[model samples]
Target chain A: SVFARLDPELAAALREIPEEFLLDLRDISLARRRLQILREPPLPSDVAVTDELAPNSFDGTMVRVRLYRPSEVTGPLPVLLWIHGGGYVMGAPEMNDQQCAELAQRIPALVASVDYRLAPEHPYPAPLEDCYAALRWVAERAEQLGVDRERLAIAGASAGGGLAAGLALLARDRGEVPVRFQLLIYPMLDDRNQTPSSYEITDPRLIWTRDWNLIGWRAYLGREPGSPDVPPYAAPARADDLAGLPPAYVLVGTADLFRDEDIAYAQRLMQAGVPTELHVFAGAFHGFDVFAPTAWVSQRANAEVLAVLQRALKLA
Target chain B: SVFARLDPELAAALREIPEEFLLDLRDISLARRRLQILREALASLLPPLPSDVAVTDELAPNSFDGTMVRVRLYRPSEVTGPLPVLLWIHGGGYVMGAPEMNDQQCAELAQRIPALVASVDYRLAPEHPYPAPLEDCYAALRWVAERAEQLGVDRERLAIAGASAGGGLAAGLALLARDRGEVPVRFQLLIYPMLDDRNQTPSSYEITDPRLIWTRDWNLIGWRAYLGREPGSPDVPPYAAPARADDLAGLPPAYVLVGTADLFRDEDIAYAQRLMQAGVPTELHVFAGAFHGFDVFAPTAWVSQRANAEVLAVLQRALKLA
Candidate 1:
């Protein structure tokens, strides 16, 4: 039944690659390669990261961060704090270097990408704690970085997306951090991964699927996959209390396993009194934007992410 | 200049009748005979008033001494079972005439649309004042909805309609019913309604030239008699002057018609625009080269016929009679 729903080309592509080869190229391995490409020494004409550094606290954990400022800074700039996504397993601030560079060029803002800890090696609350600490760090040092605290926004893709949403809930609960907007693209919000699409789509060509999601959840929770004892902080979708959260922009592809969960989360957020905008693209799979850069859906997905970020940051 | 624009036939009719006759007719003795003749001639030309009525006194006053405020009902001769009812009010500056003036219209509307039409004779102004006319109409509407079976009317498909001053009254009545949590009127048919008391329009100023509307002086007299005060006073209530009503939200859907040469043209347009802005579905038709009361006088004229067609189309859709 699941095979019937798959696009013929993607099904054929998956058949061409062996299961062993696909398993080895997990999200962590992909993130490592992307980050290495981003961390290559800057060219002579390329803009460099700013020297501004800050330290701050989040729910007790301390975090250190650096701000990247654009050359043409004339007015109060919009701020974007990038959170890396890897199913809360493996990813870093350096992995979002290309995205940060693009954002700095397009929006008048200082992008502060946080270096959050991963799961298995660190655990569930540790990464979330690091991200939250980084948010506080940037906000506390807003004056030094020439960033407007009022125009502050959070953005992430996939697991990072889930963390961003978790941070918003935490800020609302504490009433200390004020977030004007949240941008979540193809987020892994639900830890259960029990939605119909989650169980049905297990293709390996798609970056994330049912098996991989289960693995990530187990690695993060330090328990058996699909365990009922999952925490809301680790999986924001499990949180029943969503009131007083800021407006959000969520996007997902219809063919992705995360589609159902993403849509459900967006709807629940709306019902819980949070203004949310959702977009589900047709005929696109998870991480297709990275795999096929020239595809129309890929370009559109990229543009939509930037647009949402710009809107949240008040740069457009 | 105003006299020059009058239709030749209407001008001739005016010329044939002496000004002294008009003045002398006010004595009641002289007016009695003329009134009898006019009434008899009108009755002869019109079909018998429909007697299939559903009477109720829902909003009756303590003293029911005078003529009972009964609604004269008319239904299409061929229709069977339940049909939509039109709570129609007639216009005569809120002073002269009664449901009798709209007898032809009601009968034709019933015959053409194959539905029930109840022509109401609400109490006139100068004697009853602002709320009385509105109250009477509201009472009749409530009675109609409450007793839909007796009236052979489909309660769910009921509408309110009127012409001239009565059109304005219908609009106000619909608003009152909605705000007061009474009968829900589905649609409103307003024909050349006197919406704004301010009368601030080029058509109002230019068309009052005697040849078109008889004279602006006649409107002034009617205004004073109906309002019992200045027409455009700052303190005038919205009920007295609908155009003064700032918000038109939650009002029933409307179908409005006006003539290019009518004094109420701009006011009618403004009213329609307000209804649309408030998200109420509305249809407006403005007939060029037509004056106030022209449709009745020259029903066969091109402009009048076109206006009638538009009105008939609107009524069909609003009432769902077709």
Candidate 2:
């Protein structure tokens, strides 16, 4: 049963997205164009983005990357590694320009958005190692890129969030690239999708439906989602040992498809003694902030993202 | 594993808690005197703690046993409706806390949620722990549910809410209601509830700083005082420590909020997650810069305001659903 847990302002603002705008992550190319068309237009800014690529030494591929640098900011600013969401099928750093450019301008930091190869063409090790390789590239060129070497963080949304989470695990295990904190916005952490919330939420009107999620997981893992062979890193939620990970700040909506998984992941993270902060916005669907930035809930979500990001980066 | 997740301002403010102000809940007489003294001093400095909420009292006779316990009711004077009732249990780590000490909280709740509040003054531990305190809260809940018609409140809208030890009782009460079929709790508003007596949680171990509130030693004493036996005994029932309960299914929808600096952060979160796992519509929030009872101690703090807003909004929605 569909519930009305959304705030009045958010509910009214949600009218901007028609029911027919449901996400289609089944195919890569068509879905790519559709998502790109719906995304907010690029904002005018003094901030500049440099299109680049990192050599994925493990997979013998060059991982495309975009570096967003704020204008007039000098003296070794912090660097952030950014990942985009497309359920692991298709998405580009270009899709996140409006927010990435705004983030660069709002904060004194260098934003490096990863254009990792999509799955089905380049699966698990390719995508995960691509982001990891990008991290190493940013670290190696810290002095050359004019950003502080000591202050580097990783952030991602949705599938990008899951991969970034996996990267956090790999970073901890591999013992390099000290990620200060993670800003996970509605992260896609679980591939099993067996939680009660996964079963309960089946509204097609939802931006990311169960079918879309299954499609995303199958594409990303290149196999069935709930199989015995599925390892922890594919969807970071399957990871048994969450201890020793970097501090995490997660944001998700109660109405979103990933709400339960995100909430459970946060709980496990805290239980594992990780400094984790999680916020679940009631009555919000997936990408509420992206679709309706003017809504009360959307604005709060966006504001908290910046605030917690500032807190994580600078505050004690 | 007891960690320091306190907000910087909260950490700085935490320095104000004198090292000599450590709570000792072992000896009943000394702890009671200490708690009352501190609370009275708090009352004197806090502008009379907003006393305009209507107050009523009743001795609810326990159904299982004939023992009677006091139930304190706080009805809003200004807001009028056949309002929902929040059966509140005051927190004392199972040692001390007077219903009168929570006058401000109840008054504020009555006004904000526009619901009639019934704050229970259950017995403390050591001399009266576990069964006595829990049973007393049950009696009060039953009285609230039974008299809802006469009290001009909706029975279906009955809820359980509390902070600290009180939150534990509310949690235990919800479990009992589900298993025993005594009363149906529509919702539970838990404020950093003290659920585990084991005291081995990461935050529980980390909050041993004597300068701050609710140290590990104080926790063990409260558990010993409440259980009348060693903590984590085989006899410890689900009603005593809700985290021990295996089956969390069929519980009421819940709202749990805690601060990173509090001892009960992990347990409260675990309870909420388990409730959610059991198919309960559970909501949780973690305040970065707060300690136990920080909302009352630092009511004007930004974190406190957000915490209060979350609770107010959650309670309003839950009760309004009836």
Candidate 3:
């Protein structure tokens, strides 16, 4: 069993996860409550934060975004738009407050985290459109934000990663705004749920299992997942042509349910002539970095993210 | 065009590469001569090895043709045996390269992993084709396994690794050892291996830029000489081209690393993917904006350092030296 090969340190953390968090996802309120406990505790940082509303074209709704930047950085800072992970069912920009603030200070760039709408409540195009709205708002107001519009990068984790990838496809196809790079952490790209890993990772003890994943996908797609007629924008993997996307950085754990899909996406990205980098951590489960942040593998993965951001943003 | 996408740090080093050393592969004689000159000239460029890491060379009997294969051993003076062993194969396509070209790498591996490392100087192809180079490697492997106790190395912890054509040989050797059932291999580290004689993958066509170290033209030439026939032809055995092997099951666990811009990118990824499909524990890492041999060519570059760090970590974990 793949679980038998989990890294000793990660396995220990997996064992310590509160049993309440691993329950069935049918009850949305309980799932949200459990996720609240898993959010990273806030720490003090000099990165200044502010809130803003970006006008969403769909339904005339205004999307809220939390912006972060070094307290001392001057104009023309490179930008990174971060989307927080919650399996597309529950999460907000505040869920990633610590990460966004640290990245802003580290890159000394304007890091904006969108409070995208969740699934079964707003579903499908709502979340992705909100992300795209945030992307456009940053570039449209780059001068006031004191950031460079030409060097914008998008990043997200889990469900957020899926939205970011979908947004990249939308950005490329629409040609309204340009994205220089994309950073996807274990992105949920394929709604097909046909990869060997999609079925193989059935461990209920893990934080994100196949059963929970199916619930998340069904809610996000607003229908049963793996159906025919699901659009590419809904699941980037369904897109037949992946040409003309931004350079990508994709990372995942082999034990994660999205491993096969993510790997396939990355390989296809390379074949499409898109500059792509892929890193697969052995024997690591979903959200290993969040649960075991101090573990060697987690630390390495975290450091690699910052390094890639610095390079892609041309701040190194 | 791919040259323009080279990692910024590595691009700076590429600019410094001499014109005379750009490699004219049109003639095998000229290529070998240039390689010899380049080898001698770059000897001083190798990183200084600590005195604690000892190096020695011996000749192993190659029963395939009764020829002797040169094997160089590296052992950390402070590390006690019996230590895990690594069989290091040097890469210069299938045509050229010597164990001494990898002295620094082998020594660092020995010191870092605190294990014994054997860098095999196998025969080149064309003059000595398929069975020749592969057999030389097998002789060196057999020599290490047969003399593991005398060499103060652990037989159970044996691993094989190589870059380029040598990696191809290592993959073939793993398959060979599996079928022969004489020796056991713990892992196989393939560094952008030249595994496919069929250079029809996307990267094979995409990476035609001549400025980079290895290109499609160079690959076609390498495969032809190694196989002693037109590459991609019917009847090319799996031994000469490991990618031609239909069954990858029962092989040792594998670690495959390649650059996105490499000509072998797709083939290497395909091999790792198949290895996974065949139920072998495989780790695949693809670095962006990196060309073939980036880690070896520009060891100090940021991307190269990252790649090397992964290699060392994988080696320690796979060999159980950590």
Candidate 4:
């Protein structure tokens, strides 16, 4: 039934691919190992990369942050603090090396990706605080790092997007840094898992599904999701006041599990007077661009993302 | 306050716009006359047009009212058929625009998509309400389909497109076409469509600023004029306001585009969501800081150009022209 409405190129790509990939959070270690084995080979990049240490806000501990900058580009450039996505429990800055380098070269900005501690071992405030610390670390040394504090933006995909959103709220409440823009790409915002699409994406053939979502939220929150006591910082969608948040670009596929939640958030941001742009592609599953990057739909999605980023950063 | 949220390019353009263009249209007859004069002035201010498109005018008879409706046709001068057809409708709150107002876009669509574009000059409302204008549109649709072979166009690839009130008419026409089963519409391009006459959405109430091209008060006047009665009545049919339609299944695939500051934003978003729920493949785009008819107001603005580019891309895909 789900395949009937898929984009033709995506459908063709799906046919030649491997069997359905399921996220079995039951045994996290084995799953992580399997992901490492399945990881694609990294390609050469034209950007300069460095790994630096930043103090975590929660415990004053050091966390690694991978910084990317165009090899030939010079000082005081626009910055994009990117967060990688892996449902929060299993992701590293290294997982998104290719994309970070690509963004650094193309947007010609300094990109700093946070390598925060994963969840289940380091839950809630740990991952988010580490991200916030990375934000501060960049802002504090803006001139030395050759990054522009005024043009700084936060961006991520999936779980990292959720963290970026929480980091934005945390930054505003603390009144330390002012974020210029937010590029939320199919972000995992709501911990409730109660939206229509939250249940609709049940097919395991797609990368992420309802079951995987439940495990991801359960592991990150350190308790069952949809509970009454879940706080806003842990789940950014729970934030009642989206006012004064940065201008936003919210994008998701119609078939993604986060579709309804993402749309609802984008709509609310607009209502709160935040300049928000929303584009929903029909018949696209979760992580469609990553899985089928050559499809027309995916290509368009990629192009739009770059265009929006350029405009938001004033790099155009 | 509204100016603060406007697209920067559009905001700059708004500064130089003449104050007379912002006059209230409470007097429907006076508004019609004023629009005709303003339309001519605006047309004279435009740059030169491209020469790759051929334009012609013909008449299609309205069998329901026994009157003839004038239709303008745009065809690619260097392209050969059978070409896909796009039936265009112009917006002036359903009472004050002619096909001539949309000539530039129609000609461009013809050359770009390399399809036959026929824009119908449907009758205005208050004098010709409800079925009269809709019937004129249906008559034009029939003429296109019946004469498809002669015109070297494909009947199955016909699409209906419009902006604002005309978008409302195109949406209603799609419903009528599906029900009557006389002709089939492949796609519907609704650009900030005026779908809900109830005027109860949050945007409908929030966007009451008179400085905008189309506002809540102007919307109410247009709906009342077209319905020949007060809007939001129980007896109002889907043919008058498409958002009132109970069954949206089997309708053509839709592309609904609206701006954040437009009064129709919420209603259009709801309608697009409903269409998708009804199993109609729908593409919805909501641009930031744009108001109703922003494309027409500042054609060279990035927002306007991007909107036009998206329309062409979607149209080509839906009509299988690309």
Report the number of the highest-lDDT candidate.
3
Per-residue lDDT of candidate 3, residues A1-316 (tens digit): 4356577788888887666657568787777877677654454467878899999988899999899978876668999999998888988788777888888988767899999998889889899999999999998999888888889999999998899899999999999999999999999888888998888677777667788888889999998989888889889988889999999999988678898899999999988878899988866778888778998789989998998899889743
Query: For residues A148-230, could you state the per-residue lDDT of candidate 2 as single tens digits?
Result: 76678899998989988999998889887888888888888788888766765566555667777788788778889887867
lDDT, residue A301, model 1: 64
Report per-candidate DockQ.
0.01, 0.31, 0.56, 0.66
Residues B77-175, candidate 4, lDDT per residue (tens digit)?
787759999999899888788998888889888888868999999999878888788888889999999999999998989999999888999999999
| Chain A (alone) TM-scores for all candidate structures | 0.85, 0.93, 0.96, 0.96
B1-322, model 3: which lDDT tens digit per residue? 3457777777877777776876667787887777777666555577587699999998999989899998999989997658999999998889887898888889999999878999999888788889899999999999999999999999899999999998999999999999899999999999999999999888898766556878888888888989899999998888789999999999998889999889998899888877766667777899998888888777789889999998998899888844
- Report the Cα lDDT for candidate 3: 0.87
Query: What would the per-residue lDDT of candidate 4 be over residues A1-316, giving only the tens digit for each residue?
Result: 5566677778787777677354566677777776766774453466888999988758989978899989777656999999989888887787888888888888878899999888788888889999999999999989889877899999999998899888888998999998999999999989999988788777777678888889889889898989897878788888889999998888887778998888888888888888998888877777788789999889888988888888888743
- Given candidate 2, what's the lDDT at residue A245? 91
Please give the distance, in angstroms, between residue A252's alpha carbon in candidate 3 and its true position after superposition: 1.5
Q: What lDDT tens digits, residue by residue, belong to model 1 across residues A98-184?
A: 668767767657777877767777677777778777777777767876788998888788888888888888788878779988888
How much does each candidate deviate from the true structure in C-alpha RMSD?
Answer: 22.1, 4.5, 2.4, 2.0
As for candidate 4, its clashing pairs are: none
Per-residue error (Å), model 3, residue A60 = 1.2
Lowest lDDT block of 10, candidate 3 chain A:
A37-46
Model 4 chain A, TM-score vs. native: 0.96
TM per candidate comes to 0.46, 0.81, 0.93, 0.95
Task: Output the lDDT of residue B146, model 3.
Answer: 97
